[PDB]
Amino acid sequence: CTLKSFTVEKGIYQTSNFRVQPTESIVRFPNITNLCPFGEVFNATRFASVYAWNRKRISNCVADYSVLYNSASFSTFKCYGVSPTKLNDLCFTNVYADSFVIRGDEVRQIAPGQTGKIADYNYKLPDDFTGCVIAWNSNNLDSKGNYNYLYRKPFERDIYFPLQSYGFQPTNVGYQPYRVVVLSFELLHAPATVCGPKKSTNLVKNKCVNFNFNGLTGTGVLTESNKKFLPFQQFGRDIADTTDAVRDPQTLEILDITPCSFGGVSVIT
Amino acid sequence: QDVVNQNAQALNTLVKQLSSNFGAISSVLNDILSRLDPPEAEVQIDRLIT
Amino acid sequence: AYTNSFTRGVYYPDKVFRSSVLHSTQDLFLPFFSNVTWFHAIHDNPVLPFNDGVYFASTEKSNIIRGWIFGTTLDSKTQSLLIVNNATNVVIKVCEFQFCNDPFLGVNCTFEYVSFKNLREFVFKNIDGYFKIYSKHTPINLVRDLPQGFSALEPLVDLPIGINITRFQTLLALHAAYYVGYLQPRTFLLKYNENGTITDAVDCALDPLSETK
Numbered sequence: 435c436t437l438k439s440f441t442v443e444k445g446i447y448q449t450s451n452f453r454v455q456p457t458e459s460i461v462r463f464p465n466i467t468n469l470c471p472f473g474e475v476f477n478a479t480r481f482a483s484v485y486a487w488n489r490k491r492i493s494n495c496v497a498d499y500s501v502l503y504n505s506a507s508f509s510t511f512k513c514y515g516v517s518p519t520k521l522n523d524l525c526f527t528n529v530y531a532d533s534f535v536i537r538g539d540e541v542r543q544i545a546p547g548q549t550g551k552i553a554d555y556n557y558k559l560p561d562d563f564t565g566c567v568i569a570w571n572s573n574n575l576d577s578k579g580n581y582n583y584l585y586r587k588p589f590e591r592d593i594y595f596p597l598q599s600y601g602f603q604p605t606n607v608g609y610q611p612y613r614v615v616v617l618s619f620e621l622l623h624a625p626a627t628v629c630g631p632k633k634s635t636n637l638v639k640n641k642c643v644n645f646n647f648n649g650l651t652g653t654g655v656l657t658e659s660n661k662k663f664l665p666f667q668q669f670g671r672d673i674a675d676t677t678d679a680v681r682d683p684q685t686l687e688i689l690d691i692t693p694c695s696f697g698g699v700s701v702i703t
Numbered sequence: 704q705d706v707v708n709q710n711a712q713a714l715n716t717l718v719k720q721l722s723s724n725f726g727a728i729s730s731v732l733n734d735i736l737s738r739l740d741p742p743e744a745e746v747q748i749d750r751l752i753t
Numbered sequence: 754a755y756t757n758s759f760t761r762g763v764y765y766p767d768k769v770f771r772s773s774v775l776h777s778t779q780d781l782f783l784p785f786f787s788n789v790t791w792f793h794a795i796h797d798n799p800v801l802p803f804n805d806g807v808y809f810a811s812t813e814k815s816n817i818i819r820g821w822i823f824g825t826t827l828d829s830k831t832q833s834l835l836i837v838n839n840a841t842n843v844v845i846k847v848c849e850f851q852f853c854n855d856p857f858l859g860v861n862c863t864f865e866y867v868s869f870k871n872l873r874e875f876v877f878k879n880i881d882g883y884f885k886i887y888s889k890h891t892p893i894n895l896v897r898d899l900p901q902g903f904s905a906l907e908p909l910v911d912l913p914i915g916i917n918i919t920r921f922q923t924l925l926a927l928h929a930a931y932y933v934g935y936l937q938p939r940t941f942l943l944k945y946n947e948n949g950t951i952t953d954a955v956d957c958a959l960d961p962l963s964e965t966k
Binding site: 515516517519520523524564621651652673674675 | 722734737739740
């Protein structure tokens with residue numbers, strides 16, 4: 435089939451690649467069970483302004499992205515850097531929630547690389563940003579004559595002056611109040627401080643498996659190693675940036691890694 | 704010695720290439736494969752493959 | 754004054770092991786052979802800059818130095834960082850305290866935290882709100898200056914404070930040699946040994962032979 439013939443002359447003809455399949459999947463994590471306070475993030479009694487947006491950091495918990503994913507009470511859900519369905523499985527270094535109310539005519543300004551009177555002076559967005567923003571109008575929560583909302587490097591709070599209040603009237607469409615919330619996800623190569631609802635699992639060694647140490651993916655023969663990791667060291671590496679030991683996040687230990695044998699298949703005939 | 708060193712240098716730069724973005728949002732293929740829905744992973748992985 | 758930081762202040766850049774490799778980096782560092790303002794804490798602690806990561810240092814047998822008031826203005830109008838070590842632990846704050854004119858200890862605000870021969874190198878840098886403090890507690894032998902010899906630095910702390918911090922001021926137990934280097938974006942070629950310890954680092958923004966290295 436590979437020579438395009440019916441008569442194969444005497445020789446040695448490479449044909450394929452034998453790469454041992456992995457046996458099974460192995461998932462390790464730190465045994466933590468805190469719930470990230472997503473309630474106050476989305477059920478805050480009073481949202482900040484576009485110039486005084488709050489930045490409250492969450493950590494050391496688990497985040498159920500589905501129970502917020504199904505939220506139809508919100509007007510928009512657009513995730514730039516990552517596919518929001520996989521958030522429930524993705525887990526990363528940190529999060530940052532920023533809540534504030536805007537007018538309906540500004541939701542397009544909130545995007546990585548966009549501009550506008552809001553997107554530049556008082557709320558710049560990062561260019562390499564990875565994450566997403568959620569939003570919803572608040573015609574029945576903020577507008578009553580709501581004029582207590584003002585506007586003037588990204589995420590700088592610069593707290594005839596440019597001070598100016600938004601004229602909010604419950605009878606407005608684009609002139610309606612709109613509550614917005616954005617999240618930032620920095621996928622550094624670091625010990626993740628938050629992870630989604632992923633249950634830890636057992637560990638097996640000396641067998642091609644699918645190891646997932648806090649998100650570090652790959653397959654190999656997880657043999658025990660004597661690499662003296664000084665207690666501040668998390669991963670290992672090699673000459674050319676190849677992970678070559680890790681630390682089991684659920685219980686400290688240092689074990690080697692080697693990708694199990696592959697190699698082309700030659701056919702003699 | 705020079706022959707051997709030339710070949711080792713070539714191999715080493717070849718393998719080092721794997722850790723470069725070339726314009727992608729990452730160089731760890733599985734991340735793009737575990738972060739983006741296919742409608743965009745197509746673009747990213749395309750850049751990396753090129 | 755001014756003194757000659759011979760080869761001081763090489764800290765483990767990130768949390769990743771290596772072994773037997775000469776891995777170059779590009780991070781904040783203390784350049785080689787620089788001028789560290791040897792301060793006379795005999796029998797002082799003026800306001801000093803915190804520009805882009807203050808290599809601090811000291812060499813004190815009794816830790817007279819026990820305060821580190823960092824910030825922009827240090828006047829309780831903006832969130833003012835504060836560090837204290839009281840005989841057992843490290844104490845961190847953010848709250849706005851109206852301090853006196855001279856930072857000294859006798860011999861809205863949302864975050865709190867708790868936890869010669871004593872060479873104690875440092876580095877106090879800020880990156881994306883992640884305040885950092887590295888360290889090394891070390892036995893050495895010199896009262897004069899920052900001697901020859903080489904020893905790396907581990908990490909100790911990280912904090913996501915996001916404070917607008919421009920300058921700072923050490924705070925002593927006012928009833929001693931302590932210095933203040935400064936850091937800027939160099940590029941090192943640091944060498945690891947078999948056990949995984951940085952035994953020898955080489956700057957190359959310094960001079961030609963270093964660039965050939």
